[PDB]
Design a protein around this ligand. Structure first.
Ligand code: CHL
Ligand code: CLA
Ligand code: CLA
Ligand code: CLA
Ligand code: CLA
Ligand code: CLA
Ligand code: CLA
Ligand code: CLA
Ligand SMILES: CC1=C[C@H](O)CC(C)(C)[C@H]1/C=C/C(C)=C/C=C/C(C)=C/C=C/C=C(C)/C=C/C=C(C)/C=C/C1=C(C)C[C@H](O)CC1(C)C
Ligand SMILES: CC1=C[C@H](O)CC(C)(C)[C@H]1/C=C/C(C)=C/C=C/C(C)=C/C=C/C=C(C)/C=C/C=C(C)/C=C/C1=C(C)C[C@H](O)CC1(C)C
Lengths: 93, 50, 233, 159, 219, 219
């Protein structure tokens, strides 16, 4: 029917799905637009990650212009990997 | 035979055809270092009853 | 949970120990089906026989008798160079949590103050520390090569006896896997220790402190900023 | 296209369960095999003390932080720990009377493992085994809550 | 003059001790029979050593010519900045990146991490395709391919080709030893090796080596 | 007391692990069975290691006695200048060349390059004739010749001669380890090793080793 036993490999690990995921999304994620004044969406909150890593135990402020960077960065990072994994065209496309 | 080409309901082999499996139950010994058997079974000797 | 059906010798697991392993190069793997001396059967074989320093079967064994010991030392070496640089940055006094003068603290005020607490071991002698190290370690590694109490010496790579409290050491396919998680994590510990050592030579700050400095400015605070140091002239 | 992940349980589409990477994934399966409630080869007393040590130590917390004695210093820990020990006591009583009600009659007929072989029945599921498990739970839980107090009093940057 | 045979130019010449180790008797270039420790007794490991020595020899020859050329070119009629091979690696940091030929109309590499990443990519590609073959015909020989890497066609006549093999190996050994000399001159005196050349040609015996012999004195 | 046999004094004694590697079981001096890495599995390479270790041991013993004697002689009743083995190599440069015994009636070597060239010539001759034999009878044994190098004749009785072999090897191992100690003392404290001896005998525990433990601190 569907199957008779659960296959113990279901995520077929193709090793260059993740490296192309974040490597092929972050090398164009740090270009530099007019929009930020010459900064990236990977270096402008590198400043932030290190910045509130300085004063360590203080959890950063709940309105601090970098939660936006965290959320909008992962909103694309996860998407590019989840569309990379459907780059298993081994039998479909 | 039960585990075959869609031949279910083996009459003499009831514990497969019924749905009585141990899903996650392993059974082996030596989970603990030995003398906690001593230190805890000689400790719960009093209250080991109903 | 299903009993991994062994029945045979191979140990495939996912894909780890057979002819089709996972090699090192993604298309330029070892020529002619990987050099003929090593075709699986053991944890940690990937195929770097490029210098070929081990072609005899006894050397293939004796180098691995090094490997597992070396890796296990590096695991505790890594964690034992990580822990108090975190703890001192949180809330705990130590003297100096940096792993250069961690050994020099005996000379400082009164010996070794443990966790910043003046109610503990307080080792004032270096000489007694030397004595206990030599004596107890020479005993223990004598027992490693011979086999004495608390379990006899059966396999010098993996004894697997009353030493293990969990008693996991029964199903052999899951440890065809876990003998390899060992070596993967141990080579991670090896190169983390080279991080410790070469960062120790070049800049002389703690490895945690190197991570903090790097993440404060990843493009500026990295190895290349030390590149003009150590130049003759 | 000739690829499927979700399967019925051990073939057999007519038992009301179906297998998923939530239930029958390998790491999840080995994880829930290694928990103390599924080991079957150990004496139930020891399981009792392991489970009790875990649950008491976790149960102590919320009474400490959120109990009615949480702002008065240095005694907010005492009332919490004492109340948690009380809760563990009541859990021990519940285990005892469950033993008195559940295993009071005949057991079942048969059991096999998933990769079929005839495994024997777990000795936790008899009256004696369950009562011993309850005693182990009491000992472990009280030891755990006492350890929670101990751990509060001597711990580097507790707050 | 008979390297391919029992009458090769042995490691001591007329002190040859003609009882040579039997696991190499000619038939391969560079076999000079000097095995005092004998770390290449096994034949497959010996093959690995032939391949490894060839790779080392070619890389070291490239490095040696790269150590002779730019200093002479900047001494003759051009300017580079620091043509000496020490700070040529730091020419990207100084003021305006690494300008090739000392000219702001050439490479002008500003960021060294871009060179870094592209270098890793290209080097992984070429080394992998070096091991297992690939473009310009699949690699069938690990030692000397014979495919489209010789666009002039000098590998037709066999004995001259073998003489070229022996010259290649000898040049590589000399290049490796000379680059070791370059590194030791880098360590001890830390000045230009061709500056060393000019200074020793100007001073043949007054500043030879042992004025620079009391520098690394422990105390 | 049974080195030539299975009952030799093994590398751990009664932690011996009497499952010793089978490629050495007595029959050669110094076989203490301590092969943890096993870099001498091959028999001809093992022979090379026996020869090499013998050469190293004799050279190191010579150097060790050369490091003990002159300092004591200049401390007792003579003067050399710098009897400590550091600047004994630089005694030719200082004022009047290297005067032997600190006396201007002995060697008085002015130019070090003459010592250099004659030393190379003599050393090449003696090492070539060491390998392949030559004078005083052609060399038939590479390990221990038995020809006219023993003018007293102590090599008649075989078992005492084998005991002498084992003493020679043990003395050589001790000499090598001790000269390593001399080199490490040259690095760390950079003073006289017998000055070290006198200072540690005068100061047994107050200046032991770890006053000299914060010298090579990176920063
Ligand atoms: C059973 C206790 C015992 C202990 C602790 C040692 C100690 C050691 N012995 Mg050994 N020995 C012992 C038994 C015996 N040894 C010897 C005679 C020798 C010799 C001739 C040699 C050793 C060497 C060694 C070293 C081998 C590992 C190493 O290279 O160090 C690495 C570890 C460190 C350097 C940590 C030091 C801090 C080690 C330091 C070798 C050595 O000294 O190399 C350095 C060596 O050549 N031993 C005899 C008489 C046959 C023994 C019988 O008990
Ligand atoms: C290394 C893990 C770690 C640790 C030990 C702490 C520890 C702490 N955090 Mg923190 N935190 C973490 C990760 C961590 N956090 C992460 C990943 C985030 C999301 C980016 C936060 C966000 C966060 C906030 C928003 C706050 C804390 C706060 C706190 C403190 C309570 C305590 C010191 C609180 C605090 O004291 O900050 C003022 C607080 O308000 N944390
Ligand atoms: C002391 C540690 C040690 C030892 C004894 C060995 C021994 C061995 N390894 Mg192993 N290995 C090690 C560390 C070590 N390795 C580390 C850290 C890694 C991760 C990179 C690996 C990864 C690895 C793989 C993936 C494979 C082996 C293999 C082998 C076997 C044959 C290869 C050989 O001849 O190397 C002999 C090794 C030595 C003689 C050690 C040389 C040490 C000197 C000082 C040179 C090292 C300096 C270094 C290269 C300079 C740069 C340092 C920088 C990279 C940090 C042999 C059993 C093959 C095998 O059979 O699998 C088990 C194989 O497929 N190894
Ligand atoms: C993460 C690394 C790692 C892993 C995966 C293993 C895995 C294994 N080891 Mg092993 N080992 C390690 C590190 C590791 N070890 C280190 C560092 C040492 C030196 C101290 C040893 C010393 C050792 C010995 C002496 C023996 C084993 C054995 C085993 C096998 C059975 C035990 C088992 O399943 O434990 C499962 C392991 C874990 C669940 C990891 C626990 C991690 C802890 C909880 C972290 C905190 C510990 C910290 C120090 C406090 C298994 C293949 C036995 C064997 O193979 O015999 C058949 C055996 O005899 N190991
Ligand atoms: C259901 C909603 C609700 C909630 C959240 C609370 C919460 C609270 N009440 Mg409360 N209360 C409620 C309804 C509720 N009340 C109602 C309906 C009444 C009237 C009948 C009262 C009457 C009342 C009184 C009279 C008092 C409280 C008090 C309290 C406080 C302490 C209680 C305590 O010690 O907890 C004990 C803590 C536990 C039982 C913890 C169990 C929960 C654990 C943490 C869940 C963990 C789940 C976890 C995620 C699972 C993960 C699994 C994974 C690991 C695999 C606390 C803030 C006391 C106080 O002083 O308030 C400040 C107090 O005196 N309440
Ligand atoms: C008439 C019935 C009755 C009575 C007498 C009480 C009495 C009490 N309730 Mg309560 N309650 C009741 C019904 C009742 N409840 C009902 C029906 C509900 C559900 C709606 C609740 C829900 C409720 C909540 C949610 C809470 C209480 C709490 C309390 C305590 C508040 C006293 C105080 O200020 O904290 C002082 C508290 C202490 C000093 C701790 C004493 C702990 C016990 C009594 C001692 C145990 C001794 C020890 C464990 C024995 C050792 C055993 C050995 C094996 C080691 C008090 C004991 C609070 C409480 O205790 O939780 C923290 C609380 O938060 N009640
Ligand atoms: C790493 C470089 C390297 C390597 C792998 C080899 C490899 C080889 N050489 Mg070779 N050689 C080299 C550099 C190298 N050579 C250089 C630079 C010179 C010129 C001095 C020579 C001169 C030479 C001669 C004259 C002969 C060989 C021969 C051989 C073969 C057998 C010897 C052997 O097993 O070597 C194994 C070598 C190694 C494992 C390298 C170990 C390196 C470590 C770091 C020790 C080096 C320390 C060094 C002695 C200190 C001074 C350095 C200074 C002299 C540069 C083998 C293919 C013999 C042969 O038959 O040719 C085919 C032969 O007759 N070589
Ligand atoms: C270079 C010097 C040298 C060489 C070639 C040898 C050679 C040999 N020794 Mg030996 N040994 C030496 C010095 C040396 N020894 C010294 C100084 C000591 C005293 C510490 C010993 C103590 C010793 C014992 C106790 C035993 C041997 C044995 C052997 C034989 C087998 C081991 C082997 O393959 O070694 C190969 C050796 C090398 C390839 C040398 C590598 C050197 C590099 C630089 C690494 C050294 C780094 C070092 C560990 C760091 C600390 C140095 C400090 C300890 C001095 C072989 C003939 C065994 C045997 O059967 O005897 C016949 C045996 O049981 N040796
Ligand atoms: C044989 C034998 C035998 C016996 O038995 C034993 C023994 C003795 C041990 C042995 C020996 C051995 C040896 C000697 C070895 C050596 C080697 C070498 C030298 C190498 C080099 C090697 C070397 C090499 C590669 C090199 C390379 C180089 C390069 C890339 C370079 C680069 C560069 C350039 C361009 C320029 C710039 O501006 C910079 C640089 C960066 C600088
Ligand atoms: C066995 C084994 C095994 C395992 O398996 C592994 C391992 C561990 C690796 C191995 C080991 C090894 C080792 C340890 C080695 C060592 C060696 C040595 C020490 C040498 C010396 C060696 C040394 C030597 C020769 C020396 C020599 C010397 C000399 C000539 C001297 C001279 C002099 C004099 C007279 C005086 C003057 O005024 C100066 C001088 C100049 C000073």
């Amino acid at each position: 029917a569907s199957n008779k036993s659960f296959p113990r490999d279901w995520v077929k690990t193709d090793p260059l799905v993740p490296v192309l995921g974040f490597a092929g999304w972050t090398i164009p994620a740090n270009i530099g637009v007019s929009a930020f004044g010459g900064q990236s969406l990977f270096g402008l909150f590198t400043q932030s990650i290190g910045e509130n890593l300085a004063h360590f135990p203080t959890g950063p402020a709940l309105d601090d212009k970098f939660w936006l960077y965290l959320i909008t960065y992962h909103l694309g990072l996860f998407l590019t990997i989840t569309l990379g994994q459907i780059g298993v065209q081994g039998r479909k496309q | 035979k039960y585990g075959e080409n869609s031949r279910y309901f083996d009459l003499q082999d009831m514990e497969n055809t019924t749905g009585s499996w141990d899903m996650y139950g392993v059974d082996e010994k030596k989970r603990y270092p030995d003398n906690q058997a001593k230190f805890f079974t000689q400790a719960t000797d009093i209250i080991s009853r109903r | 949970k299903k009993t991994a059906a062994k029945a045979a010798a191979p140990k495939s697991s996912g894909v780890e120990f057979y002819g089709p392993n996972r090699a090192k190069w993604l298309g330029p793997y070892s020529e002619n089906s990987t050099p003929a001396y090593l075709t699986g059967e053991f944890p940690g074989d990937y195929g770097w026989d490029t210098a070929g320093l081990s072609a005899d079967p006894e050397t293939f064994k004796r180098y691995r008798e090094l490997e597992l010991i070396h890796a296990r030392w590096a695991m505790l070496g890594a964690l034992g160079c990580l822990t108090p640089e975190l703890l001192a940055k949180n809330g705990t006094k130590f003297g100096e949590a940096v792993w250069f003068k961690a050994g020099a603290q005996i000379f400082s005020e009164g010996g070794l103050d443990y966790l910043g607490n003046p109610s503990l071991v307080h080792a004032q002698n270096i000489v007694a520390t030397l004595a206990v190290q030599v004596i107890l370690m020479g005993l223990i590694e004598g027992y490693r090569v011979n086999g004495g109490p608390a379990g006899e010496g059966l396999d010098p790579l993996y004894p697997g006896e009353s030493f293990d409290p969990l008693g996991l050491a029964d199903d052999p396919d899951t440890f065809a896997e876990l003998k390899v998680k060992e070596i993967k994590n141990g080579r991670l510990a090896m190169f983390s220790m080279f991080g410790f050592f070469v960062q120790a030579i070049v800049t002389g700050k703690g490895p945690v402190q190197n991570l903090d400095d790097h993440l404060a400015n990843p493009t500026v605070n990295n190895a290349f900023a030390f590149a003009t140091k150590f130049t003759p002239s | 296209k000739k690829a499927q992940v979700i399967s019925p349980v051990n073939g057999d589409p007519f038992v009301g369960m179906l297998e998923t990477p939530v239930t029958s994934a390998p790491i999840v399966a080995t994880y829930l095999s290694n928990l103390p409630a599924y080991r079957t080869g150990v004496a139930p007393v020891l399981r009792g003390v392991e489970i009790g040590l875990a649950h008491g130590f976790l149960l102590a917390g919320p009474f400490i932080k959120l109990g009615p004695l949480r702002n008065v210093p240095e005694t907010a820990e005492i009332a919490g720990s004492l109340s948690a020990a009380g809760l563990v006591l009541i859990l021990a009583l519940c285990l005892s009377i469950y033993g008195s009600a559940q295993f009071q009659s005949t057991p079942s007929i048969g059991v096999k493992t998933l990769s079929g072989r005839s495994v024997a029945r777990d000795p936790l599921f008899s009256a004696d085994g369950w009562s011993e498990f309850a005693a182990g739970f009491l000992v472990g839980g009280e030891a755990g809550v006492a350890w929670a107090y101990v751990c509060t009093q001597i711990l580097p940057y507790y707050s």
